């Protein structure tokens, strides 16, 4: 929604929701690494069982909702994505990023 | 003819039925991605017949009007399997 | 709760309840060639989503409202049954079928 | 409503109707992309959770009303449903958008 | 209530609540084998959709009452808990009847 | 005695955790079908221990006092299981 | 007599219990396609016991009535078995 | 929080409500071993189907309703939390109710 | 001098990435049983990773204050592998 | 005249029962290469019975025409195995 | 009371660590069929480790009490493998 | 030219067809680990196709940009491989 600064450059929601979308079953992972406990990363998957995209929305969205005043936002998250085994989405995310 | 229609909710749950372990590959060659497929294949943890259908219903709403037979024929062509299988379900 | 005439019989409560206690987890493919959407389908599974029993009731339930009158709505079920490769309960509900 | 400008094209409630029944769970897709906050898709979601299609007909409105005068706002929708992986409903847009 | 003759059985409010708070979501099944419409049951479940104690036993006491006098209506309490695979609870009644 | 009584909702929380992938089969000898099964996996998706459990709930329901912790006992026999886990939970 | 009726579940359980590996060719010559095991193999990815369980439920449901004792013998032959199986689980 | 007892010590609501926290879909093995009946824990879980820490929540404050008065509950709970195999929470809860 | 802590949740998700099939052995050399990772891999069908790392959860569980990365080491090594994961994977 | 008509799903698990350890060599002259056999020996890696079962599945999505009952003559006998074995299957 | 009692899944997962391809007629040799061994060889197609540790899984199961560790000697001996790797795993 | 650029999932789903064992080592000598092959096997136990399909995506994944269709065409050669593959699979 509202990520990263003027200097850095912004995500848009059709953005994160776009990173949600070259996700997969390795969601949990970008989510330890994105720093939300496993207690929760379960309870997600409790909340829409039978949605998966659900639970890769609700998970990145409401991380955003946090991380919505911090600075580091769109960096902690090409890190964690980096380390979640996915430079392929990190790439894009940096790039997109590309203005400011 | 039929040949540029659209399957629907009942014709796609009767292909799936007939298709087996290359329903994965064809649906990769028709226009899906391998994380449509595991949102399929999560949706529906226990039981692949639900999950073949999220991924030809996908598969249409992605495409709409381009979703034609004509493309699951190639497709099915494409994954290696006797073509015919659209025939038999369309009687 | 009211389906078909006297020439073909009938089918109470006690019966497509029944009908319902003999579906798995393939009650999806019989709806679907009874007539259901699978937008319908869907917003099913995910009213019910902890409860796979009121689901397939809900399902079939919801079907015998829609079919109140009309001509063979039981003849078309029992064809649904045997086009979802049941012919397993397609033959039970013709049985208990014999009156008219 | 009174969704549509005499140049783009109209859209009637029942125009709107056809959308939001078309639609299933992957309605936030469609909402986050037509720039509706998460917390509201949070909100509204949560404010009739047992009625799926109550949802997808307050988000959908909700929205076409702040959409008042504005131009292309049709075309929003239709680029909406087509960021939703849902070509599906955004050329039965196209085509009611057949008026002239 | 007063469900029964001073023969077939009896069974009091108390002995209704005691079946009442035996069931929980297979109710449903119970009061669509005792013969109340799939109608019904969603207005009940609609009437107290969150409160499930109160579904059961305003189902249970709203058929208690249409049975007044009526003769087999114990034994068909029973009939209908054996159909919903509750034989658990068909001899709860079967045992707090052999004291009268 | 203790044998031709039934467990309770303690117990079955109890004999369920010590249970395997044997269970499918331990309560298909006791009487729940692979209909019944598939409701359990289904309304507890992601959580084995719950499945077991509810199936255990099934069963002490469908048959009443006839299920006992005798015929509990046959039960993990059938299915190459020592039986002793019913004694090592009852202590 | 009883040759002519379909087995339970509590016996199909039995059944699969029993077989080996021979259980594959057994249903495709029951009347099942390679594709419904890839389904029983796709849906029980972590347990074969239940991979032939299911696979012969199918088998059952797709044929009803015809699915029965005579049936499973000659497929209990045809795939060089001792028929002593059925005269066996049933006791 | 009245769950305790002078000599051992009290637990406090954010105490409870800290187990409740580290609880996850496991909270059923607990509340049964807590000796709760599963037609309660059935109910709850269906009371609050769509927000799991509700769930969690109220099952343990509903048991520390019941439990009020009694001698040691506190026990029972350190007990339960043990053979559910959450040594885990048992010991973070003997920590702080550890004091007396 | 940290050998004494818990790993953390973000951690074994961590150490699990870096596992291939000794994890399966290195739990059981840890405090599981069969039965529990059968129901890790029970509650992810698809996807070992999310089956690796609730097994973890499941030992640092059952193990409070114990389960340390001391643990995890003498593990790791008993299932054969360099302990030097812990380290690197610790800066 | 059957000796122009290819086998079925009943038909090609009689004919992959039978052959030896000789249902490598033997589609060495059929028509199958090397990513065809072990593309089964792969699916299937125990149970060398749906191994050689899915090589003629390939007879029939792939060749169809040149490949029916009568290139089973000299394909058979192509690996030590008389071709008599046709005759006494279509029985 | 040490060779009168059966060994835990710790153990097993060791007996199963450091032995070759002789494990099978030394796990046949202790009460299981060609069921149970087509059976752990299925449940774990790779990571044979867990195969041979279900061989045993298999047969504590089916015989509890007199499951001992000197019954885990019994096919040593008659298999090649020295007597004394039972008390390797135990010093 | 079109070197520089990752293939699609349709692309690699084309080239998991034409390709034998191989691949393995393949994907190995491309950057991915012996752990990286054996959790692809294990998240497809059945289905050849899907575990070569996941190694390339892991592979793609890893190395995003970098996984070019000149990485795929040294890949071929690093393994004896001709070449020409990736070109009729691209026309």
């Known amino acids: ?100 | 003819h039929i040949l540029n229609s659209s399957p629907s909710d009942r014709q796609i749950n009767q292909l799936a039925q007939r298709l087996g372990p290359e329903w994965e590959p064809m649906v990769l060659s028709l226009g899906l991605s391998q994380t449509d497929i595991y949102r399929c294949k999560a949706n529906h943890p226990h039981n692949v017949q639900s999950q073949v259908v999220e991924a030809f219903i996908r598969w249409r709403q992605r495409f709409g009007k381009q979703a034609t037979f004509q493309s699951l024929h190639n497709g099915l062509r494409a994954v290696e399997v006797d073509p015919s299988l659209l025939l038999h379900m369309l009687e």
Chains 1, 3, 4, 5, 8 share one sequence.
Request: glycine share 8%; aromatic share 6%.
């Open chain 1, 1 to 100: 929604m509202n990520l990263g600064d003027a200097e850095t450059g912004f995500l848009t929601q059709s953005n994160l929701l776009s990173v949600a979308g070259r996700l997969g079953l390795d969601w949990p992972a970008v989510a330890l690494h994105l720093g939300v406990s496993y207690r929760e990363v379960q309870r997600i998957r409790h909340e829409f069982r039978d949605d998966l995209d659900e639970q890769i929305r609700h998970m990145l969205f409401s991380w955003a909702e946090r991380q919505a005043g911090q600075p580091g936002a769109v960096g902690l998250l090409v890190q964690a994505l980096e380390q979640s085994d996915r430079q392929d989405v990190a790439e894009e995310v940096r790039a997109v990023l590309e203005l400011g």
